Ligand binder design. Structure first.
Ligand SMILES: N[C@@H](CCC(=O)N[C@@H](CSC1C([N+](=O)[O-])=CC([N+](=O)[O-])C=C1[N+](=O)[O-])C(=O)NCC(=O)O)C(=O)O
Ligand SMILES: N[C@@H](CCC(=O)N[C@@H](CSC1C([N+](=O)[O-])=CC([N+](=O)[O-])C=C1[N+](=O)[O-])C(=O)NCC(=O)O)C(=O)O
Lengths: 208, 208
């Protein structure tokens, strides 16, 4: 019953598509061209002048996380209790803080400090490796014994980092095995090798 | 009760202190200082190298939005349903992107951005005024007919721009009657005039 609006990019939507495609779900897509947003026909119709946009039938939503937390809750991808759902919310704000830092490296400074960003990236990644070493051994998901929407938000932030700085996971043993076992999950490994996701750019400016 | 470990400023905890003061809660502050945080060991033990940290007993926490959704779903401020609970995450994530850009100029360019961040404001609060006129007539809370942590964070976001650009709400009626109707709330009008709030810096660098 879903629909997703966005530009023909991977951007802030590549993570909510991985959970829908791996959850055994299905959805329709809608798209905005590079010029339909250069018109006003859609930037004023949005609650913040931006996309992704979502539909759940009679509902609509904005913000990449309101949709990621909305499908975790309506699909049981939010933890098992009030506290796992707090440690599943703690990984996501950190995961949304380092991507908010990656969005500025790919759109406002990739040529004047794109190497000062890979220089401090290990420490930006130690935190999540520190939580897996503190999990069931790192042999599970990022929280509890079940997967959550935080796993698809970190698995993409970890997937798009292996592309701007190859070998950024060689110091993090557990993130290297957790990022290899989730892309191997049957329905998501089928979505990563598809043209639907293999043919769009990670970003809108074309850099990576 | 709970505990808050943060710098002697209002910064990121100012909304949960209004949530814990307006919700009949009690708590302790573990004030921290630039002489204590520069000592190192307190920041090297944080999960991301930052504050505030917070607790509910054995459960520790970091990330200010995680503490607002965790006190939100534990205090009964997270919606009456799943779709109102996502319509609350939509107002909190937007109040966080405005608060995410109000925090970068205050600490990274207050002398070259305070003349452009203020003419770009009108357009940043319209959404929030549109959501009130789009619910209960705007005579209630930002979402549903009940209060939420999204409401304790959008009010703090409106009390601070009222300090960087006083008179920024003069064209946003429902937003001007809502920042006074929430400050009139009994236990919130009593804590907001209290010493631990008024003698605290909104920010931690001098500007505002
Ligand atoms: N916090 C919100 C932020 C949403 C957001 O930033 N949306 C951007 C797309 S992201 C990114 C991007 N960008 O950050 O500026 C621009 C882009 N593009 O094609 O022009 C594509 C992007 N992408 O990630 O694919 C947008 O609507 N941009 C239109 C505008 O600003 O007028 C969320 O998580 O949903
Ligand atoms: N997403 C996290 C971010 C938490 C965070 O940014 N904490 C900052 C305080 S915020 C802000 C601030 N800042 O953003 O850099 C610095 C500050 N100070 O006194 O030095 C005070 C701040 N404040 O808001 O009062 C911190 O620990 N800073 C220490 C460090 O970076 O080493 C959350 O929401 O909790």
């Amino acid at each position: 019953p879903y629909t997703v609006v966005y530009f023909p990019v991977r951007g802030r939507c590549a993570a909510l598509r991985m959970l829908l495609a791996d959850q055994g779900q299905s959805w329709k897509e809608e798209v905005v061209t590079v010029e339909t947003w250069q018109e006003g026909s859609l930037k004023a119709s949005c609650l913040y002048g931006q996309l992704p946009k979502f539909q759940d039938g009679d509902l609509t939503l904005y913000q990449s996380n309101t949709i990621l937390r909305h499908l975790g809750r309506t699909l049981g991808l939010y933890g098992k209790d009030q506290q796992e759902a707090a440690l599943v919310d703690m990984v996501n704000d950190g995961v949304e803080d380092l991507r908010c830092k990656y969005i500025s490296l790919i759109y406002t400074n990739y040529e004047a400090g794109k190497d000062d960003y890979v220089k401090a990236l290990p420490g930006q990644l130690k935190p999540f490796e520190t939580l897996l070493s503190q999990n069931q051994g790192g042999k599970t998901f990022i929280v509890g014994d079940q997967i959550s929407f935080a796993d698809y938000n970190l698995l993409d932030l970890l997937l798009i980092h292996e592309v701007l700085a190859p070998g950024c996971l060689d110091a993090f043993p557990l993130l290297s095995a957790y990022v290899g076992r989730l892309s191997a999950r049957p329905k998501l490994k089928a979505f990563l090798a598809s043209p639907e996701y293999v043919n769009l750019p990670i970003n809108g400016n074309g850099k990576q």
